[PDB]
Design an enzyme around this catalytic site. Structure first.
Site, mmCIF file in Angstrom:
data_model
loop_
_atom_site.group_PDB
_atom_site.id
_atom_site.type_symbol
_atom_site.label_atom_id
_atom_site.label_comp_id
_atom_site.label_asym_id
_atom_site.label_seq_id
_atom_site.Cartn_x
_atom_site.Cartn_y
_atom_site.Cartn_z
ATOM 1 C CG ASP A 235 3.904 2.317 -2.083
ATOM 2 O OD1 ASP A 235 4.554 1.313 -2.449
ATOM 3 O OD2 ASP A 235 2.827 2.651 -2.627
ATOM 4 C CG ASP B 48 3.951 -3.577 -3.194
ATOM 5 O OD1 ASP B 48 4.247 -4.737 -2.834
ATOM 6 O OD2 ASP B 48 4.736 -2.880 -3.862
ATOM 7 N NE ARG C 52 8.302 -5.318 -2.371
ATOM 8 C CZ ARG C 52 7.508 -6.359 -2.125
ATOM 9 N NH1 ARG C 52 7.855 -7.291 -1.242
ATOM 10 N NH2 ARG C 52 6.350 -6.479 -2.772
ATOM 11 C CG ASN C 53 6.723 -1.264 -0.400
ATOM 12 O OD1 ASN C 53 7.568 -0.643 -1.036
ATOM 13 N ND2 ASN C 53 5.900 -2.132 -0.974
#
Ligand code: RCH
Length: 302
Positions: A180, A162, A166-167
């Site tokens: 994360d 992922d 955004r992480n």
């Protein structure tokens, strides 16, 4: 409770923080299964008897949920490195369960990028960053640091699965670090495809979508999309298209367009990440080195 299975003693030396030493100031972020707080943390570091921290409060319901929490706390203790957000320890004393991380002033990289984009409805800026668009060199530094974090994870045979802006988190002096989020923030929900399972479809390669396979080479694909995010100032990949339509693009070999602010040299790196065959993709070391080269001498681009 009695032992009726193989028991593995070996473990990570997870640091435990007393709940009295954590003082919650205010809520920074929120998800369906967690909250992030800004907090002051006493007796954490030496000669810094007080310091600001990011505290995740996680709503781990089941015994299985608390096992996942311990599993994760264990991994993050092991995976500490230079471009990974710094994890200080946990607080399992009482409820909710807390994970303590360093305070990253500028929040997540997606929100940061969006706030410095040309289409930003308000100008964001401070003592360390100029309002409005960033420099080409600054954009390359960001990507280069994210890449550096991925090199370390790949060295330990570890896949993020992922990898997205955004992480990633952004601290003082534009220091970018990979983190994360398992809490499912309501802000980044359209980034995930839901059926019945939550998949970051737009960041995922063909082999993950088609064959359900995830290797370190799949993170390279995902990094190529991060590179695209950075040079579009946090725009969503395939923003016009639906989740199924985006799946059609990725599985038919249709690639993301070159961003307006992206030089061809940088787009060539992205194209290298987006080879259908995982073995044909460049290594994350090679991608990192090329970004670092470009960061030292940013190309001229109109
Ligand atoms: C399970 C887990 C695994 C990992 C992890 O390394 N995995 C690997 C090793 C990369 C696989 C990492 C993590 C984390 C984390 C974390 C650490 C700090 C923060 C912060 C924030 O969110 C954070 C999350 C937000 C975005 C909420 C924030 C908003 C602000 N908003 S503002 C400008 O003031 O308006 C200000 C600051 C922060 C902030 O510091 N978790």
């Amino acid at each position: 409770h009695i032992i009726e299975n193989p028991q593995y003693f070996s473990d990570a030396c997870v640091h435990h923080i007393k709940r009295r030493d954590i003082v919650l100031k205010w809520e920074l972020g929120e998800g369906a299964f967690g909250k992030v707080f800004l907090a002051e943390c006493h007796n954490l570091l030496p000669e810094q008897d007080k310091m600001l921290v990011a505290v995740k409060a996680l709503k781990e319901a089941s015994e299985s949920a608390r096992q996942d929490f311990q599993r994760e706390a264990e991994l993050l203790t092991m995976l500490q490195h230079q471009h990974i957000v710094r994890f200080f320890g946990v607080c399992t004393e009482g409820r909710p369960l807390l994970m303590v991380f360093e305070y990253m002033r500028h929040g997540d990289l997606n929100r940061f990028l969006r706030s410095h984009g040309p289409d930003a409805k308000l100008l964001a800026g401070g003592e360390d960053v100029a309002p409005g668009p960033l420099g080409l060199g600054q954009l390359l530094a960001v990507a280069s640091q994210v890449a550096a974090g991925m090199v370390y994870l790949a060295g330990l045979h570890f896949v993020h699965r992922d990898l997205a802006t955004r992480n990633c988190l952004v601290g003082q002096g534009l220091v970018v670090k990979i983190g994360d989020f398992g809490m499912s923030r309501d802000i980044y929900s359209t980034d995930y495809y839901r059926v019945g399972t939550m998949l970051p479809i737009r960041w995922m390669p063909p082999e993950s979508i088609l064959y359900r396979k995830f290797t370190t080479e799949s993170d390279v694909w995902s990094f190529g999309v991060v590179l695209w995010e950075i040079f579009t100032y946090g725009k969503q990949p395939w923003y016009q298209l639906s989740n199924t339509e985006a799946i059609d693009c990725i599985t038919q070999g249709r690639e993301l367009e070159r961003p307006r602010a992206c030089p061809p040299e940088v787009y060539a790196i992205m194209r290298g990440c987006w080879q259908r065959e995982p073995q044909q993709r460049h290594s994350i070391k090679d991608v990192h080195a090329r970004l670092q080269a470009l960061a030292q001498a940013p190309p001229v681009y109109l």
